Design an enzyme around this catalytic site. Sequence first.
Site, PDB file in Angstrom:
ATOM      1  N   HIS A   1      -3.879  -7.796  -0.011  1.00  0.00           N
ATOM      2  CA  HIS A   1      -4.718  -7.734  -1.244  1.00  0.00           C
ATOM      3  C   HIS A   1      -4.510  -8.921  -2.185  1.00  0.00           C
ATOM      4  CE1 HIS A   1      -1.375  -5.197  -2.949  1.00  0.00           C
ATOM      5  NE2 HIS A   1      -1.643  -5.886  -4.036  1.00  0.00           N
TER       6      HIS A   1
ATOM      7  N   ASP B   1      -0.032  -3.323   4.507  1.00  0.00           N
ATOM      8  CA  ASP B   1      -0.477  -4.372   3.540  1.00  0.00           C
ATOM      9  C   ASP B   1       0.378  -5.667   3.559  1.00  0.00           C
ATOM     10  OD1 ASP B   1      -2.074  -5.671   1.674  1.00  0.00           O
ATOM     11  OD2 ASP B   1      -1.996  -4.141   0.143  1.00  0.00           O
TER      12      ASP B   1
ATOM     13  N   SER C   1       2.842  -7.071  -6.729  1.00  0.00           N
ATOM     14  CA  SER C   1       2.232  -7.146  -5.380  1.00  0.00           C
ATOM     15  C   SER C   1       2.988  -8.220  -4.632  1.00  0.00           C
ATOM     16  CB  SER C   1       0.768  -7.569  -5.485  1.00  0.00           C
ATOM     17  OG  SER C   1       0.042  -6.367  -5.858  1.00  0.00           O
TER      18      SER C   1
END
Length: 197
Positions: free
Chosen positions: A37, A75, A155
């Site tokens: 992402h 991810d 993240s």
Amino acid sequence: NVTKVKDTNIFPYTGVVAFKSATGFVVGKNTILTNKHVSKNYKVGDRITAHPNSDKGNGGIYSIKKIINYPGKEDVSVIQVEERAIERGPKGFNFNDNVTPFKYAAGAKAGERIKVIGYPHPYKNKYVLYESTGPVMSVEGSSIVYSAHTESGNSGSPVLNSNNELVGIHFASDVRNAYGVYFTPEIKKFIAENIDK
């Protein structure tokens, strides 16, 4: 607790790099890991900065040369950089002289304390590294769940154990629990294949 990192240019913090508003970390020669992402917003040719401190000092600025997303639900994305810095770090032009890769922890268990290290508050041209600690809640397959406070800027954060060994890569929080990818054999293999050589 969540604490601002006192010295961003010593180990283990010399393993962390900054995107514009997310984190990644060094896994091998010219190679960093982050979330899909995050890297969906980047392209080959864009810049990352190795271990920046609050006041414009860093381990050099490097251009992305490749983006390789992990084929799987997890991810995880592998980013290679050009070896020669766009802007030299204090150890000169070579990426590999300026940063330190992490080594895998043997494993991880509920109850043990982990650290999530990254950039949870963005700023007008200023990167501030933080370290967040809290207990592991569980590990199942490729999921590691920890109670340590994170923000969206985390993240791509390395998750480390007490000994600064790599237990996971952060990707999500709630709202409480936060979620990282645990490095299963299948995932370590894809990383090993895709580290620059």
